[PDB]
Amino acid sequence: MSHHWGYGKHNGPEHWHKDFPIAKGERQSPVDIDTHTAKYDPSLKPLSVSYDQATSLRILNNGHAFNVEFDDSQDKAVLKGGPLDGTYRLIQFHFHWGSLDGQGSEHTVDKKKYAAELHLVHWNTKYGDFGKAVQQPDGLAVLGIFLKVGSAKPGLQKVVDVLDSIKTKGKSADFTNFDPRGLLPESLDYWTYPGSLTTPPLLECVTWIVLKEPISVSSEQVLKFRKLNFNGEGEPEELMVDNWRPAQPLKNRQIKASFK
Ligand X SMILES: O[B-]1(O)OCc2ccccc21
Ligand Y SMILES: OB1OCc2ccccc21
Kindly identify the residues of this chain, within the stretch 202-241, that bind ligand Y according to CB under 6 A. Answer: none
Output the CA torsion 218→199→86→79 (10° steps): -10
Q: How far is the CB of 39 from Zn ion (least distance, A)?
A: 25
CB of residue 196 to ligand X, shortest distance in Å: 8
8-13: long-range contacts (C-beta < 8 A, 24 or more apart)? 8/238, 13/245, 13/246
Q: Is 119 marked as a binding-site residue?
A: yes
Stretch that binds ligand Y, among 2-10, 25-33, 131-139, 162-170 (CB under 6 A): 2-10
* Other beta carbons less than 10 A from residue 4's beta carbon: 12
- What's the rounded Cα separation, in Å, for the pair 152 and 59? 21
Q: How far is the CB of 234 from ligand Y (least distance, A)?
A: 17
Least distance between ligand Y and beta carbon 6 (Å): 7
234: left (phi > 0), else alpha (psi -120 to 50), else beta?
left
The contact pattern for ligand Y, residues 17-46, with x = CB under 6 A and - = no contact, is: -xx---------------------------
DSSP-assigned letters across all residues of 94-116: EEEE-SSTT---SSEETTBPPSE
222's enclosing H/E stretch is helix 219-225
Q: Which stretch binds ligand Y (CB under 6 A): 12-20, 29-37, 102-110, 211-219?
A: 12-20
CB-CB contact of 202 with 28 (8 Å) = yes
Q: Between 74 and 113, how does the x/- string for binding to Zn ion read (CB under 5 A)? A: ----------------------------------------
Q: Is 199 annotated as a binding residue?
A: yes
Hey, is 68 helix, strand or coil? strand
Tell me: does residue 222 bind ligand X (CB under 6 A). no
Would you please indicate which residues are annotated as catalytic (active-site) residues?
64
Taking the C-alpha atoms of residue 81 and residue 87, their distance in angstroms, rounded to an integer, is 8
Contact between 122 and 91 under an 8 Å Cβ cutoff? The reply is yes
- Footprint (CB under 5 A) of Zn ion, residues 131-190: none
Given ligand X, ligand Y, Zn ion, none, residue 197, with its beta carbon under 5 to 8 Å by kind, binds ligand X
| 198 annotated binding-site participant | yes
Scan residues 106-125 and list those touching ligand X (CB under 6 A).
Answer: 119, 121
Residues annotated within the binding site for Zn(2+) are 94, 96, 119
